[PDB]
């Protein structure tokens, strides 16, 4: 199809900045091929001469020179192509990663992380072998074949006809064997995955199996899966050996037909001994290249398909709204909800909000309560310009929230997650996350605002220690107080709390809800109980998507 | 591996014969050379026939030997995997054995083939010409030292590059797995910068990797050319001297080339064999680390000085001198401290672990003396954590059954447990397959499925607990009503560890334990209208 041509053109254009390396590689390749083609001719002429010191010396010197030059070029070309491959891989990975960060949250809510890892780890390497490996081997292999056949036709115009007639019986066999192998491999892979799924299922439901004593049935099912896979293994192992036997028988026959015909032609008087030796060497060598050409051309299509699969991810269009530009100097902090209704694109036509309407004020600490199927999370999220409301509008200082700059908005308004997430960086990097620059004096001030210093300050070097992977070494309560300190380091104007008091101290919540970051800054707290009532200036319940 | 000691021996014969059959193309070739300088066709025809026959026989024997070896190795691999999984499941990794066995088998086969080939080639060369063979053996080690040294360095650089790529991959996957927070803090440029900084380190290693590759190629080519020239010179001088003919030299040259190829293959193959052999010992070490006939039970149980503990040590005992007893046809409940771990008593009722002291005989027979096959289908009940397997619903609701129940029986069991409505509402009837590990299940559906799986076997004892905790209030009320409305209170023993006092209200004799033994008990009405634990809990 034309899609393959489009992909090939895109892959050519991706390698545009590698001209100075590709030129040297394609020069050394030609030099090496031309050097390796001509050696047996000089070997045959030496043999004929032996049966005049000047000609002998000239032939020996030329053979040695060609051998050495080819040996050097065959290494220079490989080095250049390896470097080019590495450069292309490192170039494509960065583009693939930097294009994904701009996607909407629905794309990540839908796509499994395994697919992203597969694209960013395996296919970006398979598509990088197209030019340095496939298009290199195919070129030299084909050229070498053309040169060898030209020399063979020059030496004897009759003996070459037999090889020209014999070649299809090799090409067809190689094609058939490759076609069968490429599907046997994937059948084996599917069987192995299905077999592993049984062990995964047994691990998942271990308690019930031990309670009912059903091990003797899970073992039987696993044995059935193994016996299903063994047959495919045996079939592949048999096909290989059959192909090897056929290849060996065919070659011996060709050689004996070549040897007999060549001897009968020499004894007539139309050929010499060195010419027969050179022809035999050429005819022996041609077959390996003929087979490897088919192998490489068959392999190239997998790389093309992997390239298509990778490129299908970085060409997809996002669903973000139009970018904003506004950035006032002093936000008042008044937030109003007007007839807000929302439906998740992943599960559409099942609204969670039905005409929600309320108003927030700087000092009016407003608390939201009521389960509503955990719908309190949704109203918090869409106040940060993470999702767009399908109905109504949400506005900041008499302007829509979507009209403000992305970088500016998330400095005035910040929220704490319901389940805090921490990154594998240091303590200082996690507190100052997202900031261009910070000073350790502010970090101490931010940490002391959440009383987390009682744990941080016992730790060696202070704030420069490495936090465990995704906060592995921190306790549940400790992570809560670290996530809070990540907020007041930014000096927010609007603050949102997702039931932080459920794990953190209630008095700590009151201090966080009454400090300088909350004295005249709008605070919205989400509570699963009536605990927020002790300070809320405007309590608001909402159920079934409708406010109380 | 011993059980296949005969077949492998047969293989170990055939390969040897094949290794002798394929040495007829070089030898006779030299013979043909010695024929072309001394010019009948009879000897030519004889040589041709011998060469063709020997080559064909060698090919056929190799094919047969390979087939036999592969057939045996498949069975060995399958048996090993089955045993490993059985041991792992009963113990309470699998893919490691699967990914190791194929590599080990392939590398061992190649090693054996090429070792035998090399031995045969060396023997025939030594019989041919002693002096040239000695020269080749002397010059082999000196020309096979530097390429290994360069190759090790190149391999180290390659593995370093691959490890760096893997590190960057995670540096990226970790960033991409927490997108809501990154978007909330507007920190995408930071993630891009971190990824770029990670790639800037591999950019340095790639250059030296390429340089090492080029140097390795040059060294290999130079050694390959030098080796052949060194013996060609001495062979030519010997032939010119007149001690040997040209055909012997041609045969020796071909034999030397094949011998060098075999040695190089063996050197390339050996490390993988060593690594796989070393790795299999870990799997080995991980793997290596009768009852009376029951007829019927009336549901009468009792314990005297019963004790049980955790498998880690007998000092983690959660009971000490317990005296639990549930009359047949009477339903009772137990309570106690959260940290007391009384739930293990239910496990003690299921004969999962033998008592640490005393006896727990029930229905006039010892608890661990009955047959395990028939006891597990008459004393089990719904588990503490309801779940649905990946099998079909008609099979999920009857797991662990020796005989598959009929459709009418399954429907009746579901209706008695209230799961008939869930089965009817599910698409495609009972033939629908539930999601693996309860991926698409629901609390009420899971509770109904657990109740159906418990009641399908008509148990003689009930150990249902925490089933209503995961279930809804309506489902809990329905379960309680079904339990209370059973014929003559189900005419069997129930010792449910309820989580709500609503079920314990109708208890025949409630009880509460403390300090590893039952510390209080009596009628529910008496307990709730006195100084008992139930009244204190209700008032508090």
């Amino acid at each position: 199809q034309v899609n393959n041509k489009v992909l090939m053109w895109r892959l050519l254009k991706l390698s545009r900045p590698d001209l100075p390396l590709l030129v040297a590689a394609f020069f050394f390749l030609v030099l090496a091929v031309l050097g390796e083609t001509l050696i047996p001719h000089y070997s045959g002429r030496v043999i004929d001469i032996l049966g005049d010191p000047h000609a002998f010396a000239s032939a020996i010197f030329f053979m040695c020179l060609f051998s050495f030059g080819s040996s050097l070029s065959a290494g220079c070309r490989g080095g250049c192509f390896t470097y080019t491959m590495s450069r292309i891989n490192l170039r494509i990975r960065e583009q693939l990663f930097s294009s994904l960060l701009r996607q909407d949250l629905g794309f990540f809510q839908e796509t499994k992380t395994g697919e992203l890892n597969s694209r960013l780890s395996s296919d970006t390497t398979l598509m990088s072998n197209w030019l340095p490996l496939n298009a290199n081997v195919l070129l030299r292999s084909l050229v070498k074949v053309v040169g060898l056949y030209g020399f063979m036709l020059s030496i004897s115009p009759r003996l070459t006809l037999l090889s020209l007639l014999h070649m299809p019986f090799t090409i067809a066999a190689e094609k058939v064997y490759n076609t069968r192998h490429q599907e046997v491999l994937r059948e084996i892979q599917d069987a192995v995955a299905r077999a592993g799924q049984v062990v995964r299922e047994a691990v998942g439901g271990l308690q019930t199996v031990r309670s009912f004593g059903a091990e003797e049935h899970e073992v039987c099912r696993y044995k059935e899966a193994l016996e299903q896979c063994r047959q495919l293994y045996w079939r592949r192992d048999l096909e290989r050996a059959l192909y090897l036997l056929v290849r060996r028988v065919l070659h011996l026959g060709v050689q004996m037909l070549m040897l007999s015909c060549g001897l009968q032609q020499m004894q007539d008087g139309e050929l010499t001994q060195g010419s027969l030796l050179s022809f035999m060497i050429y005819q022996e060598s041609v077959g390996s290249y003929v087979q490897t050409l088919v192998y490489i051309y068959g392999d190239m299509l997998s790389n093309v398909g992997a390239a298509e699969k990778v490129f299908s991810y970085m060409d997809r269009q996002p669903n973000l709204p139009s970018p904003g530009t506004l950035a006032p100097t002093t936000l008042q902090g008044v937030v109003k909800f007007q007839d807000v209704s929302f439906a998740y694109p992943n599960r559409p036509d099942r609204p969670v909000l039905k005409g929600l309407t309320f108003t927030l004020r700087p000092g009016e600490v407003t608390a939201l309560v009521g389960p509503n199927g955990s719908g309190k999370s949704t109203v918090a999220a869409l106040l940060q310009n993470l999702y767009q409301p399908t109905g109504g509008q949400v506005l900041l200082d008499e302007k829509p929230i979507s009209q403000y700059e992305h970088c500016y908005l998330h400095s005035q308004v910040v929220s704490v997650g319901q389940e805090p997430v921490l990154f594998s960086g240091s303590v200082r990097n996690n507190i100052a996350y997202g900031l261009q620059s910070c000073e350790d004096d502010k970090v101490m001030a931010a940490a002391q605002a959440a009383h987390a210093d009682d744990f941080i300050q016992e730790m060696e070097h202070g704030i420069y220690t490495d936090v465990g992977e995704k906060g592995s070494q921190l306790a549940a309560g400790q992570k809560q107080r670290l996530a809070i300190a990540r907020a007041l380091v930014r000096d927010p104007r609007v603050l949102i709390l997702d039931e932080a008091t459920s794990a953190l101290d209630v008095q700590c919540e009151q201090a966080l809800q009454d400090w300088n970051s909350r004295g005249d800054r709008t605070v919205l707290v989400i509570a699963h109980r009536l605990q927020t009532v002790q300070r809320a200036h405007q309590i608001l319940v909402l159920q079934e998507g409708k406010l109380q | 591996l011993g059980s296949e000691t005969r077949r492998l021996s047969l293989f170990l014969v055939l390969v040897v014969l094949s290794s002798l059959g394929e040495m007829a193309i070089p030898f006779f070739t030299g013979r043909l050379t010695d024929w072309i300088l001394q010019d009948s066709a009879d000897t030519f025809t004889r040589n041709l026939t011998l060469m063709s026959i020997l080559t064909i026989a060698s090919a056929v024997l190799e094919f047969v030997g390979d087939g036999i070896y592969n057939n045996t190795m498949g069975h060995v691999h399958s048996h090993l995997q089955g045993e490993v999984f059985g041991a792992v499941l009963r113990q309470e990794v699998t893919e490691d054995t699967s990914t190791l066995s194929d590599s080990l088998s392939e590398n061992l086969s190649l090693f054996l083939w090429y070792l035998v080939r090399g031995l045969c080639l060396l023997g025939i060369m030594l019989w041919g010409s002693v002096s040239l063979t000695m020269v080749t053996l002397i010059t082999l080690p000196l020309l096979f030292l530097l390429p290994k040294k360069v190759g090790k360095w190149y391999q180290l650089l390659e593995v370093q590059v691959r490890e760096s790529l893997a590190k960057s991959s995670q540096v990226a996957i970790e960033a991409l797995s927490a997108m809501p927070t990154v978007r909330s803090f507007a920190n995408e440029e930071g993630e891009a910068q971190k990824f770029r900084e990670k790639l800037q380190e591999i950019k340095t290693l790639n250059q030296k990797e390429a340089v090492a590759y080029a140097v390795n190629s040059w060294t290999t080519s130079i050694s390959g050319m030098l080796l052949k020239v060194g013996i060609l010179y001495i062979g030519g001088q010997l032939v010119t001297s007149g001690a040997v003919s040209s055909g012997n030299l041609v045969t020796f040259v071909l034999y030397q080339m094949q011998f060098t190829q075999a040695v190089e293959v063996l050197l390339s193959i050996y490390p993988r064999v060593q690594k796989a052999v070393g790795s299999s010992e870990k799997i080995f070490e991980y793997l290596d680390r009768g009852l009376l006939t029951p007829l019927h039970l009336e549901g009468l149980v009792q314990f005297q000085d019963v004790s049980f503990a955790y498998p880690n040590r007998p000092d983690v005992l959660v009971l000490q001198g317990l005296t639990f007893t549930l009359r047949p046809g009477e339903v009772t409940a137990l309570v106690g401290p959260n940290g007391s771990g009384k739930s293990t008593v239910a496990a003690l009722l299921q004969n999962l672990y033998q008592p640490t002291g005393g006896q727990l005989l029930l229905d006039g027979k010892p608890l661990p003396q009955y047959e395990h096959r028939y006891l597990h289908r008459q004393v089990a009940a719904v588990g503490q954590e309801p779940q649905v397997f990946g099998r079909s619903l008609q099979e999920n609701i009857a797991y662990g059954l020796t005989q598959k129940p009929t459709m009418e029986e399954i429907t009746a069991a579901a209706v008695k447990s209230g799961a008939h409505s869930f089965i009817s509402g599910l698409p495609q009837g009972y033939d629908t397959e539930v999601d693996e590990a309860g991926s698409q299940l629901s609390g009420g559906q899971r509770q109904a499925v657990a109740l159906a799986r418990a009641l399908i076997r008509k148990p003689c004892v009930l150990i249902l607990d925490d089933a209503t905790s995961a279930l809804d209030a309506n489902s809990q009320l329905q379960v309680e009503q079904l339990l209370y409305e059973s014929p003559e209170r189900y005419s069997r023993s129930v010792l449910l560890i309820t989580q709500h006092l609503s079920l314990v209200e109708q208890a025949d004799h409630i009880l509460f334990l403390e300090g590893g033994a039952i510390r209080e008990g009596g009628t529910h009405q008496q307990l709730m209208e006195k100084k008992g634990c139930y009244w204190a809990m209700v008032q508090a």
């Binding site: 065959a74 490989g78 192509f81 390896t82 491959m85 340095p132 490996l133 290199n136 081997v137 390996s288 290249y289 087979q291 490897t292 192998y295 490489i296 | 590759y213 190629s217």
Partner: peptide, 5 residues
């Protein structure tokens, strides 16, 4: 067969 880069 004979894939050398």
């Amino acid at each position: 067969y004979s894939t050398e880069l």
